[PDB]
Paper text:
The E. coli 50S large ribosomal subunit is composed of 33 proteins (L-proteins), one 23S and one 5S rRNA. The 23S rRNA consists of six architectural domains that, stabilized by the L-proteins, define the shape of the 50S subunit with its three protuberances. Here, we present a biochemical and cryo-EM based analysis of the earliest period of 50S assembly, utilizing an in vitro reconstitution system with purified rRNA and L-protein components. Taken together, early 50S assembly occurs in a domain-wise fashion, while late 50S assembly proceeds incrementally.
We provide high resolution structures of early pre-50S intermediates explaining their structural maturation via parallel assembly routes, starting with a particle consisting of density corresponding to the first ~500 nucleotides of the 23S rRNA and the proteins uL22, uL24, and uL29. The earliest state we identified contained strong density for ~500 bp of domain I and the L-proteins uL22, uL24, and uL29 (referred to as state d1). Hence, 50S assembly in vitro starts with the stable formation of the 5´end containing domain I, despite the presence of the entire 23S rRNA molecule. Interestingly, uL24, whose binding site is in the center of d1, is found among the first binders, which explains its role as an assembly initiator. Based on their intrinsic affinities, uL22, uL24, and uL29 interact with their RNA binding sites in domain I and nucleate 50S assembly. Assembly appears to nucleate at the 5´-end with the formation of domain I to yield state d1. However, this did not result in discovery of states that would support any nucleation point other than domain I. Thus, domain I indeed seems to appear first, while the remaining rRNA elements dock onto an already existing RNA surface. Domains I and VI exhibit full cryo-EM density within their domain boundaries as soon as they become detectable as parts of discrete states (d1, d126, and d136).
Numbering used by the authors:
A (entry chain S): 1 to 79, 99 to 110
B (entry chain Y): 1 to 63
C (entry chain U): 1 to 102
The structure:
RNA sequence: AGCGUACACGGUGGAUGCCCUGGCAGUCAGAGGCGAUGAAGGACGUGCUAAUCUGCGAUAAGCGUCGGUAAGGUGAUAUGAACCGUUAUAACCGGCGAUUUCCGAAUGGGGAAACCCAGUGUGUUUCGACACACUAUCAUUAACUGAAUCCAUAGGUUAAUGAGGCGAACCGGGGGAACUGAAACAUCUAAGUACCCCGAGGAAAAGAAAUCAACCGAGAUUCCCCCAGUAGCGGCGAGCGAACGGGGAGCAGCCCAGAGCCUGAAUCAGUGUGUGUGUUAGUGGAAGCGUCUGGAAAGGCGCGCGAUACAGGGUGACAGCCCCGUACACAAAAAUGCACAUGCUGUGAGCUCGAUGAGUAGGGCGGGACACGUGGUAUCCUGUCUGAAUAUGGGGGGACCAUCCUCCAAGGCUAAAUACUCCUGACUGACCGAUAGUGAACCAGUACCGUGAGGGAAAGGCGAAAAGAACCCCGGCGAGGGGAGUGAAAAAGAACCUGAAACCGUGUACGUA
């Protein structure tokens, strides 16, 4: 099972979002939400929206295993607009 | 329609066309401006009829 | 003279409707025809509470070219072509295969 | 750890590649112009409209009559509301007619382009207002009047012709640049080129010999070929560039010149009828079933049909047998160009004669200027006149008269082939593929620039079929994404023609202070 959440043509610089996301790679989703709650970076809001959308899509489609959900992949593509992409799965 | 009214004399045609223009055209435009008359077929019919009658009365008489 | 008009029995030659007969109700000016129960489509319409929304997916009919449908006659049971013949005071269409009159 | 090595995943893609509701260049025809009865082009309205192309003009996406067609249409963009009738008065196409706003040559006047202010006659009247026609322009023709001047003339009025400008080309003339070659350059080619005007034109001009020869000849004008890229010209350099002669399209020479004769004799333009051929809406016009893949067959296969029709186009990929069409056979209520036989007013047949174009040619006479200041030097008139013959005067030609012949004041006039397409109708392109092709394939002379004139771009390709991701969820009631569904296909998703690297991130395995 895999979950994908992406936002295209974000009104933010690609490098800023990349460096904000790099601070979150490898951290648990449950702890990632807490980390992003108090994060003051501008890209923090958009990455929080992306991850909440990802978990919502997983709940709509996936049956369970959200609690152990882990942030597997996170990246940003240059658009200067940016395209954020996040892949989350239990394994 | 195209030919039935042709044989009518000028006086009655003038009377009916002036009647239409003064009363029913005004009523129809007022109704349209008020938003009623959801069906516009009557508007087209009356406008075309008044156009026909006014176009006539010149070739029939005096020409 | 229009070879195809309202309420005409035809059979679709191609388009997943080979040999299935139908009755065209009208013909579009662009060369398309509308035959009920021949080509069903699943149109996804935008809901609107007013104007009697059909409700969700609409199982409607799509138009097909006249070329894909050939007129059918019960005289021989097979679709054929059509010609024009002069009657006493009018021109009328007639089938082929011994020239059945419509 | 951080790089390097490559692999996969993608995105920035944009090298390359296919097409077009588009251009460009040619071939054959009409037109080769319109209009005060108001040209084109603009301003403003006419749609159930928020807006547009086209149509139209307060009667306004339309009108009356006559034909073909007629069951879908009410033009579409681009859907929706609402309509009529469906075999003859829905509607569509065409022929002929009526309205046809304002400005605009723009015309009663004014005025600032879409603006304002009037008069006369005709009507009408609710005796307040409203509609119809006319009211710029100069001369000429005819008429009524007509001064200074008796008539006349000018002048006042009326009816008719002549132009109120635009538009691609050329005929002939007038003038009239720059640039370039000449190693730069005074002259010159340049170039009579850019440019403006004049008469009417679709063709025009010219169109019939004292025009050429050289002792013999073709004999109206124009275009083209050889002649010939030759002779010749040219600081004989660059470069320019013949003629004669012989052939293709064409090939009509008459007429007023005045008298008679016999004449309304063939011919010419105008003016009715009938026929044929086009325009002018259109009619008919052949042929496949099954099997298997294939998104869908027009694709592979079998057996059959017409072919005077296998030219072409559309139909989920390649169709003679699906359709539209082609060839072929037909058709016009009314208008309509072209040919004839054909009714009639006039010019108007043919023979004899000279007439042979008079103050005409030539001769001239002083000038200015013809670019020509006589330089190689010729042309206009004048200051003017003698002034021939009357095709009997000659006519110029290389042993004087050369032998020879001419052609000169008849013409006027005369059609043919011939330059070109602003625009229209039909056909073609081994011409191009959106920075090409037109500047403009897309609502392109469009955004925009520019007072105006004028200048002036970028932007094409979804899906055969929008049948356009119903629905649900998160999200901010947005944007965006995920499930589901349609769609063969969504590694076709409205940012939708195939789409490699360069460039940016993720994972994969190797070594890596």
């Amino acid at each position: 099972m895999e979950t994908i959440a992406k936002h295209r043509h974000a009104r933010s610089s690609a490098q800023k979002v990349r460096l904000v996301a790099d601070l979150i790679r490898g951290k648990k989703v449950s702890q990632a939400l807490d980390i992003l709650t108090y994060t003051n970076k501008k890209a923090a809001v958009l990455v929080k929206k992306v991850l909440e959308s990802a978990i919502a899509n997983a709940e709509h489609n996936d049956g369970a295993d959200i609690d152990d959900l882990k942030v597997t992949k996170i990246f940003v593509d240059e658009g200067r607009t940016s395209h954020i992409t996040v892949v989350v799965s239990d394994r | 329609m195209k030919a039935k009214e042709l044989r009518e004399k000028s006086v009655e045609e003038l009377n009916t066309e002036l009647l239409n223009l003064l009363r029913e055209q005004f009523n129809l435009r007022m109704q349209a401006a008020s938003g009623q008359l959801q069906q516009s077929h009557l508007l087209k019919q009356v406008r075309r009829d008044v156009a026909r009658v006014k176009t006539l009365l010149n070739e029939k008489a005096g020409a | 003279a229009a070879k195809i008009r309202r309420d005409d029995e035809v059979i679709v030659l191609t388009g997943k409707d080979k040999g299935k007969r139908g009755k065209v109700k009208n013909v579009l000016s662009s060369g398309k025809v509308i035959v009920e129960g021949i080509n069903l489509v699943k149109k996804h319409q935008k809901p609107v509470p007013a104007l009697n929304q059909p409700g969700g997916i609409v199982e409607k009919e799509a138009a097909i070219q006249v070329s894909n449908v050939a007129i059918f006659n019960a005289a021989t049971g097979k679709a054929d072509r059509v010609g024009f013949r002069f009657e006493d005071g009018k021109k009328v269409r007639f089938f082929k295969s011994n020239s059945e009159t419509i």
